[PDB]
Amino acid sequence: AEINTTGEGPTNIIVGTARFNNDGSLANYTPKTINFSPNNGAAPNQQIKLSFGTSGSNDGLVSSNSASTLTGQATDGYTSGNLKPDAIRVDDKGNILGEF
Amino acid sequence: AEINTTGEGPTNIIVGTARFNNDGSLANYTPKTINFSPNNGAAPNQQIKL
């Protein structure tokens, strides 16, 4: 897989920075986005946009005197699925359920 | 963590006073309140009142 455009420049690695404000609230962080090409036949140049919380808020990354630990993680996305005809079930109000 | 505004002035330390009346009943004590910022991402400038 590859990520960065050019010139740093091993292809794998991004080198950004991050700063926390005086009371541990985040100030800013860079890069906010990532080009990402899997290079395995998947559609190239997916554009992820990492999020680590709004400026000046506890919602994202937060520095503190206490020991550092990861918490939370979430993202968009699925895996391909297919319907199975043997199980269908109509319900009340007449919309037809399906169970992939 | 920090507490006092300015000018004494290590940030940590408050220097108040207290007086007791003639029979041991309290007379007065100062400061009656404390600004307090944890400085760990918690909401800054909590106002305690001792």
Residues of B in contact with A58 (CB under 8 A): 41-43
User: Can you read off the two tokens belonging to residue A51?
Assistant: 């999020």
Instruction: Say how many Å lie between the first and final Cα of chain A, rounded.
Output: 30
Report how far residue A28's alpha carbon sits from residue A64's, in angstroms, rounded to the nearest whole number: 16
Q: Cα–Cα distance between B24 and B9 in angstroms, integer?
A: 32
User: Phi then psi for B17, rounded to 5 degrees?
Assistant: -145, 165
> Which of B2, B12, B40, B45 to mutate: most A Cβ within 10 Å?
B40
Mutation to test the B interface, candidates A20, A21, A22, A23, most B Cβ within 10 Å: A23
Answer yes or no: are the C-beta atoms of B3 and B19 closer than 8 Å.
no
Sign of CA dihedral A88, A89, A90, A92: negative
How far apart CA B13 and CA B5 sit, in angstroms, is 10
Q: What is the 3-state secondary structure (H, E, C) of chain B?
A: CECCCCCCCCCCCCCCEEEECCCCCEEEEECCCEEEECCCCCCCCEEECC
C-alpha to C-alpha distances, A6 to A2, A49, B44, nearest whole angstrom: 11, 19, 42
Residues of A in contact with B42 (CB under 8 A): 23-24, 58
CA distance A38 to A91: 42
- Shortest CA distance from A22: residue in chain B: B39
> Residue B33's closest CA among B45, B21, B43, B19?
B45
Residue A64 tokens, joined: 């503190």
| CB neighbourhood size of A60 (10 A) | 17
Interacting residues of B46 by C-beta distance below 8 A, sequence separation 6+: B35, B36, B37, B38
- What one-letter code names the amino acid at A49? K
State how far residue B47 is from chain A, nearest Cα, in angstroms. Answer: 16
Cβ contacts of residue A44 below 8 Å, gap of 6+?
Answer: A37, A38
User: A71: which chain B residues are within 8 Å (Cβ-Cβ)?
Assistant: none
What experiment produced this structure? cryo-EM
